Amino acid sequence: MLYIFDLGNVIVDIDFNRVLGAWSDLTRIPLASLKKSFHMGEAFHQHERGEISDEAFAEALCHEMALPLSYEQFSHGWQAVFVALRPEVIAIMHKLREQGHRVVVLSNTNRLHTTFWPEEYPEIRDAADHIYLSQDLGMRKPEARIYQHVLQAEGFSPSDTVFFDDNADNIEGANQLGITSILVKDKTTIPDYFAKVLC
Amino acid sequence: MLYIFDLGNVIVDIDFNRVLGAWSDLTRIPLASLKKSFHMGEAFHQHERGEISDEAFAEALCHEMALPLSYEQFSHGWQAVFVALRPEVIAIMHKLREQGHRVVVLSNTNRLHTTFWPEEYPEIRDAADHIYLSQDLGMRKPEARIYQHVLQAEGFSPSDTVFFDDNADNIEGANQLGITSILVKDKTTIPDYFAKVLCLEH
Numbered sequence A: 001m002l003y004i005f006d007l008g009n010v011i012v013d014i015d016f017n018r019v020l021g022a023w024s025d026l027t028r029i030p031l032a033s034l035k036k037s038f039h040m041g042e043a044f045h046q047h048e049r050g051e052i053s054d055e056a057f058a059e060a061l062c063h064e065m066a067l068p069l070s071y072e073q074f075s076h077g078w079q080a081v082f083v084a085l086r087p088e089v090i091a092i093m094h095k096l097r098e099q100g101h102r103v104v105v106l107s108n109t110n111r112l113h114t115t116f117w118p119e120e121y122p123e124i125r126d127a128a129d130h131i132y133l134s135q136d137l138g139m140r141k142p143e144a145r146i147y148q149h150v151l152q153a154e155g156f157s158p159s160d161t162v163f164f165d166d167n168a169d170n171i172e173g174a175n176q177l178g179i180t181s182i183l184v185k186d187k188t189t190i191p192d193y194f195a196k197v198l199c
Numbered sequence B: 001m002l003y004i005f006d007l008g009n010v011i012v013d014i015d016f017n018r019v020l021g022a023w024s025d026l027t028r029i030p031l032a033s034l035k036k037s038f039h040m041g042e043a044f045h046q047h048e049r050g051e052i053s054d055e056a057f058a059e060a061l062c063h064e065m066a067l068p069l070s071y072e073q074f075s076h077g078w079q080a081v082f083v084a085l086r087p088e089v090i091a092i093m094h095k096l097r098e099q100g101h102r103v104v105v106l107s108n109t110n111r112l113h114t115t116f117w118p119e120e121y122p123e124i125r126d127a128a129d130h131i132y133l134s135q136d137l138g139m140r141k142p143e144a145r146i147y148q149h150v151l152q153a154e155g156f157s158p159s160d161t162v163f164f165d166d167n168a169d170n171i172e173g174a175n176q177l178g179i180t181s182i183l184v185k186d187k188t189t190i191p192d193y194f195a196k197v198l199c200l201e202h
């Protein structure tokens, strides 16, 4: 089988509230202001597909949220994003591969050239056969093309692929291609699913 | 009672391996190198007591670890430190205060003027009556003076004071003053300690 794992809130817990915290710390903008104004716009989508620079992205979000930050200060806060490994999942992924299933990561990512980000974590690189990243591909979930890219480059069909994502639109994109798609509701979803599959 | 909580590996999980990671990512220095060269000596202690600047600290660590980083890049990676709340511990601290106990944080801190650090987290500021920080005091644990400062400022005696910290040297400095010191071995030490306090009422 081909197993495709999303990264954020699938392999790792990730919380951008910590970034808002960090930017609130520097700017003294009340945290509640940054929460009501931090939105997943087109600038996000473009930056995910690598279509605009890190600097242009910073500029977009700063204008949206009225952040008087330099690029460097922006990045500095960006770096604070809360990331915690789910070791249960890293282990399952290693086990799937030593049983000779194929295990890849597929991630929409807003990494910057100046930040250290989860797809760069050694524990995540060593758990995966390949890591597919939106900025590298010029594509993002839930666009058909990105799923197709992975199917094609891995050499598997939809019916022979299972995909895990905590985002329902992402799941929908994969389903339209007849990929088996498991919504990740919580910590248990992947351990439960692989109870009977590893045995 | 007066409750003194340490911050790191008591109220929060903290892991500076994430910082070494971020620095390996920028500098391309092998991680294993930064692990062998990253030591908590003199410049740390000075910086904890606010006795050298952030920049002079950054400089001291970059000298020892051969990091070709600006101050900004230092701070940038410093900021990556892994920090996870322990919500059970936050809940206890709140419960203790609405029972009328006095709940404070005492922390040796290597915060920089450019970083967002756990003592600044709103969840932590609001769980505690006061937060005592080494850089502010010009003192660090396990120096007698820092424990004395808190007993004096709070107006409590050693025997009315319970202190939680994961570092054994810290536990010793507080024991030398007859403070009831509880070594935090893991995430159950503090839930357990307070279950046994609850169990003692009738």
Ligand SMILES: [Ca+2]
Pocket (backbone or CB within 6 Å): A112, A113, A114, A115, A116, A117, A120, B025, B026
């Ligand atoms: Ca990087």
Ligand SMILES: [Ca+2]
Pocket (backbone or CB within 6 Å): A025, A026, B112, B113, B114, B115, B116, B117, B120
């Ligand atoms: Ca700060």
Ligand SMILES: [Mg+2]
Pocket (backbone or CB within 6 Å): A006, A007, A008, A009, A010, A165, A166, A167
């Ligand atoms: Mg996700």
Ligand SMILES: [Mg+2]
Pocket (backbone or CB within 6 Å): B006, B007, B008, B009, B010, B165, B166, B167
């Ligand atoms: Mg500690």
